[PDB]
Fold this protein.
Amino acid sequence: GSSGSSGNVDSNQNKASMLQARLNDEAGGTRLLRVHHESDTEERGFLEKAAVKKMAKAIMADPNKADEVYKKWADKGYTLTQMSNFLKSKTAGKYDRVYNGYVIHLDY
């Protein structure tokens, strides 16, 4: 005693684009330039911090140079923001006499 009449049916099966024909071959290539895993480049400041500070050091002993320096800096295009950050040196007072001087130099 078994039952089951319901069924199914489908006409559409598949198709192919027999409109194009491969009469010739074609070359190719692979040029993908992109790779990176770990790399940190902060020369912008890394270098400056050293340069900006370097000049100050020379001033510590040579206070007569300060003036000359201040002119060089302002010329480069520095500002209290950056300058200070460079003369900071994670200290509560390392290159003050130098930092202050520059501040006034721009006060003009």
